[PDB]
């Protein structure tokens, strides 16, 4: 299978940008439906951002979540400009990418971000 790893997780003060991306390692037939998620210590599953050639994000953060799609290295980037203390949650990237099997649905281990 193809392992997903997260890079760019770190301590970030409220007010600046965070760049978090999920790299894929293994037999990748190309990028496919990828969705980024968050969960705070106490809230349930919710859809944060992703696609729906149509890209969707969360409320009031449309201009702050900016992605950059790169297919040559089969991995994209995501940037969270002007973070807020209410965004303290673990981002999970779930990708249905094509493999030796028809598709693979995997959840990124994610990186904790503490914003306060």
């Amino acid at each position: 299978q193809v392992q997903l790893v997260e890079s760019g997780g770190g301590l970030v003060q409220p007010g600046e940008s965070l760049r978090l991306s999920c790299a894929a390692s293994g037999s990748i037939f190309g990028i496919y439906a990828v969705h980024w998620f968050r969960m705070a210590p106490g809230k349930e599953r919710e859809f944060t951002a992703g696609f729906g050639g149509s890209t969707n994000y969360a409320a009031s953060v449309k201009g702050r979540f900016t992605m950059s799609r790169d297919n040559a290295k089969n991995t994209t980037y995501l940037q969270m400009n002007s973070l807020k203390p209410a965004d303290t949650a673990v981002y999970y990237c779930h990708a249905l990418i094509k493999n030796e099997l028809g598709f693979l649905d995997y959840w990124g281990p994610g990186t904790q971000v503490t914003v306060s």
Binding site: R45, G102, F103, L104
Partner: protein, 196 residues
Amino acid sequence: NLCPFDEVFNATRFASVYAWNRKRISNCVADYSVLYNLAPFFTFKCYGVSPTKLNDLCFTNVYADSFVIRGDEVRQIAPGQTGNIADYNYKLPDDFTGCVIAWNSNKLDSKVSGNYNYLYRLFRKSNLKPFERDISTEIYQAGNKPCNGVAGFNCYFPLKSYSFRPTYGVGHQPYRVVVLSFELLHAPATVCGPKK
């Protein structure tokens, strides 16, 4: 000769129901004795022929669909059955001719934090035709008020995620399911097991 049923029945992981993993198997020999004698199999009920004499019956086509669902909604596998998973993810027509097997994988599909890796479609404005996969996930709208961009009232994502944890008992069993179809085709019969 052996048909490659082993990797299907011994797959490491089973995909989501809306991304139901289906494979066409052809041009091999498919003995049913090993699968029939596979002890940990729990339910194996077939709908077209007797489920103990498939070897002498030769069929041109073999379709296998594998996935994981709740133990509560296993009886939703039946063709034409009601249910959110049947309506928005994958439906079985009442004329389907084939077999279905279900068993338990709770010891490997249970997460101490809750198995949220499994997902299922929940909203769809036009019911999917039999044997169809739908991937479009736009922001669904229901009322006459236009909906676009942010979520909220009349704007809900058409997918939902399972909640499976080891503390769950009866009614929340993560059960592995495989569905076999051998609908007759004009192509000559190729796949069938040895005859004693």
